[PDB]
Amino acid sequence: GIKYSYEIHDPSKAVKAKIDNAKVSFKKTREASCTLRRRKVLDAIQYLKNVIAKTECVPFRRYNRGCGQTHQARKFSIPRREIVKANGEKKIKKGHVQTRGRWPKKSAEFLISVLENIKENAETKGLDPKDLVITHVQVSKAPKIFGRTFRAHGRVNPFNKSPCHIQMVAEVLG
Amino acid sequence: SKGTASFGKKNKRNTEMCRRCGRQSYHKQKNSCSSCGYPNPKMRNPGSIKARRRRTIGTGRMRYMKRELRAAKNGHKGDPILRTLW
RNA sequence: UCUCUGUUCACGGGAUUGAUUGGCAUUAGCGGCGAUGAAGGACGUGCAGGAGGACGAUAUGCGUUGUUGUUGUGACGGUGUCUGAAUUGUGUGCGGUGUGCACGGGGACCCCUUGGACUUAAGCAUAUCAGUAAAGGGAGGAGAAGAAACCAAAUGGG
RNA sequence: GAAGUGUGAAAAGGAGGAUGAUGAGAAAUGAAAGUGAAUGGAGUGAAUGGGGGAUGUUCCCGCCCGUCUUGAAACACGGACCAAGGAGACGACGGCAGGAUUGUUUUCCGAGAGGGGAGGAUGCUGCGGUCGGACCCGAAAGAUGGUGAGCUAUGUGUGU
RNA sequence: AAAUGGAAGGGAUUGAAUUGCAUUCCGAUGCCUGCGGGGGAGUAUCUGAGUAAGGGGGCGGUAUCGUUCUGCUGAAGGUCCUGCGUGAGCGGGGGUGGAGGGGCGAUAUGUGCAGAUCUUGGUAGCAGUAACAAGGAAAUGAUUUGCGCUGGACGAGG
RNA sequence: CGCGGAAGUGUUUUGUGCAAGGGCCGUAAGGGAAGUCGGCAAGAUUGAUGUGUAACUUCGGGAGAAGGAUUGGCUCUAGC
RNA sequence: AAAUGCCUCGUCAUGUAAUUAGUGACGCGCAUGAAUGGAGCAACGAGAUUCCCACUGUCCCUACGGCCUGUCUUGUGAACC
RNA sequence: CCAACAGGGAACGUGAGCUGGGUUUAGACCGUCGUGAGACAGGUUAGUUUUACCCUACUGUGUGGACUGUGCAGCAGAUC
Ligand SMILES: [Zn+2]
Incomplete structure (x- = not known):
């Protein structure tokens, strides 16, 4: 699927998570994520x-x-x-x-889902989820989904959705 | 009120399925098909250049004419039993 | 942070390069439908099935013959619901109450009938486009034509 | 009256994520317009360009192209952006130029009656001329053959 | 004596806006002089702006016949960096890609795009804006309570 | 009919509390069409029962002409 | 001097504080006139005109109040140019 | 009535500000003109007024204390 744009050095200390073609507004979701980097993983869940x-x-x-x-x-x-x-x-x-x-508040539920997957991937590698720092967040545009709407004088115009992709990487800064 | 409001009165149907050609174009008050011309013994002259290639020889199954063409390559020998009489 | 502008990675879209059981042209043969019920239409048929294709109550196929052991197949013969010229009819020949024939499909090319206007004339009416397009009737692998009430003016041809 | 062809030699396998397996390769190639992330530089001046110099700028010069027009930066018209497609080719007949092969070439004047010796031919390429859809795209109309009174108008049968 | 605040080009200037002068100086892609490139000319040289229009010499797409080469020890295409050419354009290097690609002479053309309110496809800004929805409640809701007015049959049409 | 009720039927349970300017309405001192092309818009009259009704006129009308008065609740009387 | 009169806001009277309006009268009438129908208004008219009573936020000159929008939130999310 | 009731410019200032009386296509009447279809800067009556959510301009508002100085910009009372 969609590939990561981050190069993870020392892969024993990192965790990853993704969602492709998420049914949520791209512009609202890209604003909600613009203050998440360099936060602790547990403090970004309480902030959202x-x-x-x-x-x-x-x-x-x-x-x-x-x-x-x-x-x-x-x-x-x-x-x-x-x-x-x-x-x-x-x-x-x-x-x-x-x-x-x-x-x-609908972008915030989608970002809480991705942050919970990163919290359950750290358990399998056995490292402390209170020591994770967010080092990478990226929200991109996905392909359009088509619809319609009715205008006066017997006309029709487009009425479409704008979804997105979401990636994340977390690290232990020992 | 000749636009939208006049469309709500159009619930009568003038045609039915034609028993020669199968289109919804047999006009009941006229007693006549507007596609094929039934009940005239001959079929109607087509109304366009493309109309000639939508319904002709070969656009259906050709259940008998295919058989006859395989028989004319071999001289029209028939059933081997009856060949003694002929 | 925002605006503009370098660099690297990830998107978005389907151009480009290379393929092709398809199309297009020229040439040689053929031109093989129907009252012994055609072309076309409607509805049906698989143990588990919708589309397409195939098939007709002998229905997702039967017989004979060749090749096969396979989801088997080639060549030929039989069957073919209800419709449709669709006719248990109308016209007509030979007989004297029996038995034939015509009708519809197709019509590129051929024979007969009928018959435009756009257009050109730097305008337009005779003229031109043109006896052409469209329409109708009648045939075949071709059709139509054809064995001088001819051409001519030579030392005549046919 | 449309739009839509491609995993691989092999299914050897995937399809929320993560961890993995198979394979020569994660899997036809994958441009521009436009966008997200990180990181370097600059700015409160519309931006962009040329000369001359330099790891951004400081001096000089510089109004937006195409078109019709006596005359356009124009308060003249077309142009938001990118890809691909997109317009003097072909036939007939004549002339001339350049070139190829061969050369023992010529039915004249005049309405007629009458009179009477004076280097071309056949191809090839290009340009000018005419008729052909005729460099490309565009009328208001005219004619031949067919379809409609389920909207609406009038008459008539039978009901409310 | 005129209608937005405004023009010896401006700040200014009592001669830095008047008149008369020259013994100095600055100032073009014009002139003289040394090299370089093109085109003429009878070969010691002379001469270069240009719309409409016409002539000469070159660069590039796709194929044919005819000759001459290269690719899995990694071709074309695509992307970044770099050399040559007045220019149209032609080469080399590193990634990517995973199958073919060229030089030279003659010959055949559906042979080169910024525009046509051009054709088809994709994509921005506008803008998370206009427009639309959020129906009275009781932790629960087969129970309690608050509001609206069409409700039930036959035909056409589905 | 309008103004209100049944029967049957439909219906939800964490948006704000209300600037200017709009759309649809309500009340206004004193004046009373001075407004405006123009009484546009709004205001005004309104049911029923006694009373009283002009010019004109095709003798039918005009006519509900105009103008004036009365109206609730309670407890009784009179007629058929 | 009429939905027919150029000259023209014709001339005289009447309604007003004030009348290019309205009505009455006058007539050499640019260009009135007899089924091209002339004269004439009882009854009828969401027809065109002028005046009177009544009534009022039409106005002097504006004020205050109601509900739905707008202002603020979540979801869905265009177009012209 | 008044102190007085001057004259002009700003796309003959000002219609995504309004209104639509003049002008005002398609209905109709009269007069004159024309054989007629029709004509008249001759009269009369009936006749749709669309869209800002963009840039700038302008009005407020925001762009992080307390006490003050001093530059710039605005500027108001007039008449009986
Ligand atoms: Zn039919």
Whole structure:
């Protein structure tokens, strides 16, 4: 099927999981996964369960035209930094305040399924699921699925789905 | 109201299955098939160039004419029993 | 983080290269349907079956003969529901109440009837396209034609 | 009145994931448009280009192509993006040019009555001319032969 | 004396916007001078813009006949890097791929694309936007309670 | 018929609580068509029973002309 | 001076504070007129016009309130250009 | 009535702002003209007003304390 784009060095410490042609919106699922890397595997499962209860939000950064504003999104702001010696010259970099977020909740169930498979694959190799770190997440586009809808004056237009593929790799950083 | 609303009145059927050709084109008030022309003894002249190759010799089974063609390659010898009488 | 732009890996789509039990052309033979019920149509047939193909109540096949031991097959003969010219009819010959023949299918090429307009004339009416297309009737492996009430003006041909 | 051909020499085998097995090979090849992940550089200037220099920029020059037109950057028309397909070829008859083979070539004037000696032929390639669907795509119409009163209009039989 | 705030090109300038001068200087792809390339010319040389249009010399696709080579010790195609040519284009190297591919002379052509509101197929931005759905409840729900108004038969059509 | 009820039949159980601007409606001091091409739109009259009814007129009509009055609940009387 | 009159907002009277409107009267009428039918309105008209009473958010000049949308969430998820 | 009731420009400012009275294809009447089909800048009556969710402009809003200085931009009272 679909191949991994990550090269796993030291394959005794890694774990993998996949889903091909998942029946979930590609754009919403790609936003929900954009803060998962470098988290602990058990802290990313609790973070996605608070998104379903609506106590933490998902930051909307790329596919976000006309999204709602909320106070929970200010936790992902980028601070003002100093960039010394671009090419020998020091410069200054303003920050960004986030302000846009949402609570998808069907993308969050799909990502919890993939994270549970990685947790049961670590048991067979006998390593501690409290020591896993997420080192790789990728959400891609899958082929379209066709449908239809009725418009005024006896017309028909397309009415389609946009699914996706999901991969993940986890590692022990000893 | 000559559009959508006029379509809800179209529940009468004028035709039935023709007993010569098998299409839904035997008009009952006219007593006439619009495809093959039944009950005229001859079949109707086709209405288009393609219509000639949809129903002709060879588009069905040819149950007898195939047999006769195998018999004319061997001089039409018949049943070997009856050959004494002939 | 976002926007633009290098690099590497993974997608998305089906171009390109190479194949082909298919198509297309020219040439040589043949041109083999029907009241002894055709072509076409409807419905059926396998122990376990829908499509297609095959087959007809002798139904997913029977007999004879060749080759086989196989899911077996070739060449020839028999059977063929209900329909359809579809006729237990209509017309007509020979007889004197018996017994024949015609009808439908196909029509590229052939014989007879009927018969356009687009188009060209830088316009358009005679003219042209053209006695051609379309329509109808009648035949065959071809058909039609054919043995001078001819051609001519030589030392005549046939 | 369509669209749709390909696992392999062998099924030796797969089809949620992971761990694996078989095979020469995971399995026809797999471009562009467009996208995801990681990592390097730059930016708050529409972008892109040429000269001259350089591991991005700093100086100079530079309005969007095709087309009709006296005249287009145009408040003239076509063009969101990529692949593949897509338009002066063929026949007949004549002329000329270049080339090949051979050369012992010629029925004249005039309406007629009458009068009376003066190098071509057969192929091959190209260009100009005419008729052919005639460089490619495009009318409003005309004619021949057939289909319809299940919508709707009028008459008539029989019901509500 | 005119209708958005505005123009000796601008900031400015009392001569840096007037007049008269030249003994200095700057400034083209034009001129002179040394090399290189093309085309003419009677061979010591002379001469290069160009739409419509016409002529000469070259590059490339697919095949035929005719000659001459290469591939499982890894061909074509495809991708990245690199050499040669004024150019059309032609070579080599490393991955991928798993079966064929070329040079030279004459000959046959359905012989080269950015456009035609071109044809067919695939794909972006717009945009997770417009539009639509989320029907009163009781941890449970064959029990309790709240709301809406068509309900039951024959024909056509299925 | 309208305005309300039966019978039979249909129906769910973790979206928000309501800015501007829309669609369909309600109430308004004092004035009373000054609005507008134009009383468009809205407001107004409305059932029944006594009373009272003009010009004109094809003598049939006009006519419910116009204009004025009465109306609930309770307890009784009179007629057939 | 009419759904027929160019000149033309004809001239006189009447309705208003004010009348290119309406009605009455006048007539050399660009170009009225007799089944091309002329004159004429009882009854009838979702026909075209002008005025009176009544009534009012039409307006002076706007205010406040209701329900459904919009604003905010989850799911499904186009098009024009 | 008034202090006074000046004159003009902005795609003869302004229809994805409205309205649709003029103009206003297809129905109809009258007058004049034409043998006729029909004609008239002659009169009369009846006659569909589509789509923003994109870029910019403009209005607010967001872009991370407390007390203040000083530059820039806006600018209001008029008449009896
Ligand atoms: Zn038939």
